[PDB]
Amino acid sequence: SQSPNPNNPAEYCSTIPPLQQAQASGALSSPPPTVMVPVGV
Amino acid sequence: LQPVTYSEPAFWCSIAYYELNQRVGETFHASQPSLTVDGFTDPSNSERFCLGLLSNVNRNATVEMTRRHIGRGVRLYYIGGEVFAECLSDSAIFVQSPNCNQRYGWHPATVCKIPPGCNLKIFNNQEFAALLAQSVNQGFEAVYQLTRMCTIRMSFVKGWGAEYRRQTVTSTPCWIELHLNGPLQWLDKVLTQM
């Protein structure tokens, strides 16, 4: 299929408490993201 | 010269309130994981940005009606880099988040809606991280472009763009703009490393 429609909140929003969405996901135990950066310009 | 890792900010976001084209009040700097932006006349605190008493000499009738409807407003959460927006207001809040847009494959200027009692992850740091990852390969330019992803616009009752009467954010009566300092600080460290 495609993706959620900006006009239909039910397709992307939630009523699950954010803390519980963070949980069952990661956000506290998940290590901070790291990118590999060069050195030029 | 080495990797550049994300650093949790001391002040996760700075919120600027606006009434149409008018910047109203001063910047709120979120130092706590939670924070509410509402239309109440209570004193503001580390976790509360009360807009109720913010005066604007250019406040017209429309803005006055919209402000009366903000009510409980929006509760913003920063949970390990992820940012959520919850509509506590009885009226919906419209969000223009480049991060969500990129996520849902929406037009970069798409504005969605968060109905009362609902929430939306307006910022996913993992996604921004992956985006930053591919951006360091597109050179300096693209990396600096990410500055756009670190900003979110939100209107309290009326929407804008796409087929709404109002097209630009400046056209809505009550709106705020968030600057995710975490991602911005990360961008700065990446740019200085280049």
UniProtKB/Swiss-Prot annotation, chain A:
Location of region: SBD: 1-41
Tissue-level expression: Ubiquitous. In the brain found primarily in the cerebrovascular smooth muscle cells and reactive astrocytes.
Quaternary structure, from the entry: Interacts (via the SBD region) with SMAD2; the interaction recruits SMAD2 to the TGF-beta receptor and is disrupted by phosphorylation of SMAD2 upon TGF-beta receptor activation. Interacts with SMAD3. Interacts with TGFBR1 and TGFBR2; the interaction recruits SMAD2 to the TGF-beta receptor. Interacts with PML.
Compartments where located: Cytoplasm; Early endosome membrane
Role this protein plays: Early endosomal protein that functions to recruit SMAD2/SMAD3 to intracellular membranes and to the TGF-beta receptor. Plays a significant role in TGF-mediated signaling by regulating the subcellular location of SMAD2 and SMAD3 and modulating the transcriptional activity of the SMAD3/SMAD4 complex. Possibly associated with TGF-beta receptor internalization.
Gene source species: Homo sapiens
Lineage: Eukaryota, Metazoa, Chordata, Craniata, Vertebrata
Source superkingdom: Eukaryota
Effect of Q23A: No effect on complex formation with SMAD2
Effect of C13E: Diminishes complex formation with SMAD2
Effect of V35A: Diminishes complex formation with SMAD2
Protein name: Zinc finger FYVE domain-containing protein 9
Domains (record comment): The SMAD binding domain (SBD) interacts with the MH2 domains of SMAD2 or SMAD3. The FYVE-type zinc finger is necessary and sufficient for its localization into early endosomes and mediates the association with PI3P.
Swiss-Prot record, chain B:
Record's subunit section: Monomer; in the absence of TGF-beta. Heterodimer; in the presence of TGF-beta. Forms a heterodimer with co-SMAD, SMAD4, in the nucleus to form the transactivation complex SMAD2/SMAD4. Found in a complex with SMAD3 and TRIM33 upon addition of TGF-beta. Identified in a complex that contains at least ZNF451, SMAD2, SMAD3 and SMAD4. Interacts (via the MH2 domain) with ZFYVE9; may form trimers with the SMAD4 co-SMAD. Interacts with TAZ/WWRT1. Interacts with FOXH1. Interacts with SNW1. Interacts with CREB-binding protein (CBP) and EP300. Interacts with SNON. Interacts with ALK4/ACVR1B.
Similarity remark: Belongs to the dwarfin/SMAD family.
Disease: Congenital heart defects, multiple types, 8, with or without heterotaxy: An autosomal dominant disorder characterized by congenital developmental abnormalities involving structures of the heart. Common CHTD8 features include double-outlet right ventricle, unbalanced complete atrioventricular canal, and valvular anomalies. Vascular anomalies include dextroposition of the great arteries, anomalous pulmonary venous return, and superior vena cava to left atrium defect.
Effect noted on mutating L187S: In LDS6; uncertain significance
Tissue occurrence: Expressed at high levels in skeletal muscle, endothelial cells, heart and placenta.
Outcome recorded upon mutating N56K: Found in a patient with Marfan syndrome-like phenotype; uncertain significance
Organism: Homo sapiens (Human)
The protein's name in its UniProt record: Mothers against decapentaplegic homolog 2
Subcellular location: Cytoplasm; Nucleus
Domain MH2: 12-194
Outcome recorded upon mutating D38V: In a colorectal cancer sample; somatic mutation
Post-translational changes noted in the entry: In response to TGF-beta, ubiquitinated by NEDD4L; which promotes its degradation. Monoubiquitinated, leading to prevent DNA-binding. Deubiquitination by USP15 alleviates inhibition and promotes activation of TGF-beta target genes. Ubiquitinated by RNF111, leading to its degradation: only SMAD2 proteins that are 'in use' are targeted by RNF111, RNF111 playing a key role in activating SMAD2 and regulating its turnover.
Described purpose of this protein according to its UniProt entry: Receptor-regulated SMAD (R-SMAD) that is an intracellular signal transducer and transcriptional modulator activated by TGF-beta (transforming growth factor) and activin type 1 receptor kinases. Binds the TRE element in the promoter region of many genes that are regulated by TGF-beta and, on formation of the SMAD2/SMAD4 complex, activates transcription. Promotes TGFB1-mediated transcription of odontoblastic differentiation genes in dental papilla cells. Positively regulates PDPK1 kinase activity by stimulating its dissociation from the 14-3-3 protein YWHAQ which acts as a negative regulator.
